[PDB]
Design an enzyme around this catalytic site. Structure first.
Site, PDB file in Angstrom:
ATOM      1  N   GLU A 121      18.055   2.693 -38.737  1.00 60.13           N
ATOM      2  CA  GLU A 121      18.079   2.439 -40.179  1.00 60.13           C
ATOM      3  C   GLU A 121      16.630   2.423 -40.701  1.00 60.13           C
ATOM      4  OE1 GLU A 121      19.584  -1.626 -41.519  1.00 60.13           O
ATOM      5  OE2 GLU A 121      19.393  -2.159 -39.396  1.00 60.13           O
ATOM      6  N   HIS A 131     -20.376  10.419 -42.385  1.00 53.42           N
ATOM      7  CA  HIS A 131     -18.986  10.323 -41.902  1.00 53.42           C
ATOM      8  C   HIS A 131     -18.901  10.796 -40.448  1.00 53.42           C
ATOM      9  CE1 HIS A 131     -17.612   9.769 -46.060  1.00 53.42           C
ATOM     10  NE2 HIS A 131     -18.405  10.773 -46.393  1.00 53.42           N
ATOM     11  N   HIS A 142      -7.325   9.490 -32.287  1.00 53.41           N
ATOM     12  CA  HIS A 142      -6.617   8.639 -31.324  1.00 53.41           C
ATOM     13  C   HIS A 142      -6.030   9.427 -30.161  1.00 53.41           C
ATOM     14  CE1 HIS A 142      -5.832   4.999 -34.187  1.00 53.41           C
ATOM     15  NE2 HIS A 142      -7.116   5.259 -33.999  1.00 53.41           N
ATOM     16  N   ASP A 182     -12.652  10.125 -35.607  1.00 53.00           N
ATOM     17  CA  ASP A 182     -12.060   9.615 -34.379  1.00 53.00           C
ATOM     18  C   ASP A 182     -10.614  10.079 -34.262  1.00 53.00           C
ATOM     19  OD1 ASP A 182     -14.108   6.946 -35.051  1.00 53.00           O
ATOM     20  OD2 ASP A 182     -14.201   7.948 -33.127  1.00 53.00           O
ATOM     21  N   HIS A 206      10.123   0.060 -46.134  1.00 49.07           N
ATOM     22  CA  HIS A 206      11.168  -0.896 -46.492  1.00 49.07           C
ATOM     23  C   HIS A 206      10.743  -2.370 -46.584  1.00 49.07           C
ATOM     24  CE1 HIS A 206      15.210  -2.258 -47.327  1.00 49.07           C
ATOM     25  NE2 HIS A 206      15.683  -1.031 -47.229  1.00 49.07           N
ATOM     26  N   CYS A 239     -11.900   8.608 -39.938  1.00 45.12           N
ATOM     27  CA  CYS A 239     -13.332   8.387 -39.916  1.00 45.12           C
ATOM     28  C   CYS A 239     -13.575   6.929 -39.512  1.00 45.12           C
ATOM     29  CB  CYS A 239     -13.880   8.657 -41.310  1.00 45.12           C
ATOM     30  SG  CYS A 239     -15.639   8.376 -41.543  1.00 45.12           S
ATOM     31  N   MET A 280      -9.753   8.055 -45.730  1.00 48.23           N
ATOM     32  CA  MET A 280     -10.328   9.011 -44.770  1.00 48.23           C
ATOM     33  C   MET A 280      -9.607   8.945 -43.430  1.00 48.23           C
ATOM     34  SD  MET A 280     -14.273  10.156 -44.529  1.00 48.23           S
ATOM     35  CE  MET A 280     -14.720  11.577 -43.560  1.00 48.23           C
TER      36      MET A 280
HETATM   37 CU   LIG Z   1      -8.494   4.016 -34.713  1.00 49.55          CU
HETATM   38 CU   LIG Z   2      17.572  -0.486 -47.891  1.00 47.76          CU
HETATM   39 CU   LIG Z   3     -16.022   8.637 -43.662  1.00 45.51          CU
END
Ligand SMILES: [Cu+2]
Ligand SMILES: [Cu+2]
Ligand SMILES: [Cu+]
Ligand SMILES: [Cu+2]
Ligand SMILES: [Cu+]
Ligand SMILES: [Cu+]
Lengths: 336, 337, 336
Positions: C276, C92, C97, C95, C303, C133, C147
């Protein structure tokens, strides 16, 4: 406001009209807060959604898919009388994404056939908002049977751009977009049923594929074309309200633009400008403002073009007026 | 502007270049409005879209998928000569999302094989905009056959951020993303067809599933990798224009960010900042501006990771320069517990 | 900062807490930049995700799906010790962001079973960000095995609205949304596997349909409902961080709104207001700020209502306090 204060407010009774038209209203609020009264009868009815005669058991606010657009102003009260006639088979209710408390009203509006209810809520936030039925345990089933619509809560001073300049429309249209999930037999032919409950299990199987068989405006393929094409003239300012209660959409006016687009549907969020294709997530309504500059036929579509042109999500505008060769001209027409 | 006034405007002939590169242009406009002239021949052609040799009967503006990026400035006129050679078998046209009227130009550009047409439109609004073929009755079929691209209409004063500061890129790339719907046989193997028309019915069935078999940049799985990887350097400012004519995408520069992102593609709509993953709805173009800060390999993807790494929507950047341990460091390299 | 300056920064170990809860932090940064230290052990384990005993071979940061929320401030460093016990069978990595370089840290954190690693990165940008991961060549498989998590990088001065007024929450929840792709035998029964790798081929086939079998919060259908509903009181200000590492979502607080929504998850991008339903694209986190105005049960959903009510993407809030009849009232309760 207190109970007494609300009781003292003016009342106004509104007569709703069928989509894509919108009932009579004023952009700038006329007077102080009012209690705006609406009545809708729920109709369970067969609708035919394509040219192959495919049927949906619709569950229709005011007898239409989508339900009608209700227009109030910020801090008015919307007071809805909702009627479930004895001729219906299912319990229904109403949830306003515009409202606050009791799941948007659904917890207080559960009506069996033969019952009615009256819900009042304060429209505290300006924008366009989805409303839809949502009976506990059968929520998406009612919504994808067409039991959804929208409201518009205008700012008391009407619409403005991101810099406070007034935006006044000459016309308004309401496009309710519907994803349908119609069961098919072994030969790929759409199934018909003689009661809404008969279709449930088969429809749920299709729903769970997350792949609609039809994606339509105003309840059917081609509904907003020909006799029902929307209209404008060069110079005219048009607001297009667009909702989708269950599934994402990406509206696009082919030949035009969204000059101002409240993509989130909320008027206190500044609109995007010069839009080619805007985006409305499932469970929301948005609004685009456009001034027509060219005459002719426009296609208004969900711009997944498979959804538009294979699944049914295409409407037309027919626009009158003078051609503008500065904006566009055929310098050499198609030729050998 | 009157016909006489438009006639008086200077003309500039532009030579188009194949994506992901963009033809020579100036960010800030040079002089007043011009009539910027482009020519494209449409090629119906077999392309291979993956390493297995899977074929599509592409419908390609200027012979490429995507079609090339046309660059003009706001209030220039874009004048396109569109040619449908007699060797093709279908009628084609062109719809510019940038344009106003006649379905974006579609109503005025329907050309049969052996025909040409010249369309002029005023580029009234700044941004990146999709263009694509849309013949009535056969619209999505042309688009998902690769018959789409994008244009950029720069503001006359070049790019700025949401708050008036000039933004000047060192380089620009155009990433056209394409959803393909390739029919499979009973074994689950991709089918090949003799003529484009033979593929129609089978392809419409796949299209209706709304599930692409391939989602690719620059016409094929891995097209922007290896010796075709995009390149940059630490400190270099890169604009990445991204288009998807039919289907949503969620671009992400893995290892980087979108520093300024015009997610809607429209330059008068203030850009989002500090983006991890941005969103471009089908039928639109977007643009992201980034200054590289770390050397090494980056993957630029549609961040539905299945679409990226199973279906083909990943490109690479190779970035030169000095590693910055302030920004990131391996305090302890993978080692036994 | 110079080498000596970085070296001289205080180091602070923080104890993590399982989602939807969030570890101890201050909204306004306490002191100057710190190196905030976290430890997470990766657990590979079978989890049951629905009421039918359906299993997933989960790959879980800190033993949970999603992994826990890590909270730092802008210009702090996050310094993660990541441990892959020898009882695990897969390589494993991680990462972020939020991070810059080496694919977000993945290039530097590739740990086999029986290995650990320590990654430090400077949190240069304020917002909520996905981490996941991503082993080269097996990226979506790890991610859709659960993950993934998120971090929050608060501005040093806490949150603000578009006008720079401070927004201070009373509580914060982290809702991680997970698309699962569970293989089925030809009778439609979910399959079970002895080891994670045994499920690989069958799972990738389901993945390539782009149609999840389950869409869940906190790792399972109903994980955030009933006795595990999230809570609030009328007048309480709540931040709801929501992530989806692989697939789009459209959160909606049923009965409420997103008063301020950083839909892109980035605090330097002004928040949308009065929302909303907001939209978080696959591979991002977003955050919504809401002040509860009404007591009762709320549903918090993706939704797409099919994803919410058929596939599992529905949580609840239980909210205490006094009903506000001004905001909403039943004028006439359901009746014949
Ligand atoms: Cu990514
Ligand atoms: Cu609704
Ligand atoms: Cu992983
Ligand atoms: Cu188009
Ligand atoms: Cu209903
Ligand atoms: Cu074409």
């Amino acid at each position: 406001a207190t109970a007494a204060e609300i009781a003292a407010l003016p009342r106004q009774k509104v007569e709703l009209v069928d989509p894509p038209f919108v009932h009579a209203h004023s952009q700038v609020a006329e007077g102080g807060p009012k209690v705006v009264e609406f009545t809708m009868v729920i109709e369970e009815k067969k609708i035919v959604i394509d040219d192959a005669g495919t049927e949906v058991h619709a569950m229709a606010f005011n007898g239409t898919v989508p339900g009608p657009l209700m227009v109030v102003h910020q801090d008015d009260y919307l007071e809805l009388t909702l009627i479930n006639p004895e001729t219906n088979t299912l319990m229904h209710n109403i949830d306003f994404h515009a409202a606050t408390g009791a799941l948007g009203g659904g917890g207080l509006t559960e009506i069996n056939p033969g019952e009615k209810t009256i819900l009042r809520f304060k429209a505290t936030k300006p924008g366009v908002f989805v409303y839809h039925c949502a009976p506990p345990g059968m929520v998406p089933w009612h919504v994808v049977s067409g039991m959804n619509g929208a409201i518009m809560v205008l700012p008391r001073e009407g619409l403005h751009d991101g810099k406070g300049k007034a935006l006044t429309y000459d016309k308004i249209y309401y496009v309710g977009e519907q994803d349908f999930y119609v069961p098919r037999d072994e030969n790929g032919k759409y199934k018909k049923y003689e009661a809404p409950g008969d279709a449930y299990e088969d429809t749920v199987k299709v729903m769970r594929t997350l792949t609609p068989t039809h994606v339509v405006f105003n309840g059917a393929v081609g509904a907003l074309t020909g006799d029902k094409a929307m209209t404008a003239a060069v110079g005219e300012k048009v607001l297009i309200v667009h909702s989708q209660a269950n599934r994402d959409t990406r509206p696009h006016l082919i030949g035009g633009h969204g000059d101002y687009v409240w993509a989130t549907g909320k008027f206190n969020t500044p609109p995007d400008v010069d839009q080619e294709t805007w985006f409305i997530p499932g469970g929301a309504a948005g609004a685009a403002f456009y001034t027509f500059q060219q005459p002719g036929i426009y296609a208004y579509v969900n711009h997944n073009l498979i959804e538009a042109f294979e699944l049914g999500a295409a409407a037309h505008f027919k626009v009158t007026g003078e051609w503008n060769d500065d904006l566009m001209t055929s310098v050499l027409a198609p030729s050998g």
